[PDB]
């Protein structure tokens, strides 16, 4: 597959970039579930995924 006719990498077509391990998804009012924020986890809490 030549993606745009010349490239070789799968394009990124997500509304928001994936949140990191230390962060968690946060909603944005008026936007669908595919669009979220990357609010950091509070102290005493962790996230591995």
């Amino acid at each position: 597959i030549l993606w745009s006719g010349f490239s070789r990498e799968v394009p990124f077509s997500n509304c928001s970039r994936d949140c990191l391990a230390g962060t968690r998804k946060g909603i944005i009012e008026g936007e669908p579930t595919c669009c979220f924020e990357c609010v950091e986890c509070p102290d005493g809490e962790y996230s591995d995924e």
Partner: protein
Amino acid sequence: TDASACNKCPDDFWSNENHTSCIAKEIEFLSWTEPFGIALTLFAVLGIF
């Protein structure tokens, strides 16, 4: 109500137990009017006498 995310309380203040409204961080020092402070100053005055 229906708050998407919790907002940061000002620096001088701190949130209460229900996280509804945040109040000022309690000042703290050995007050002259405090019972311990008044007892210590009474002891010092009696000793000076």
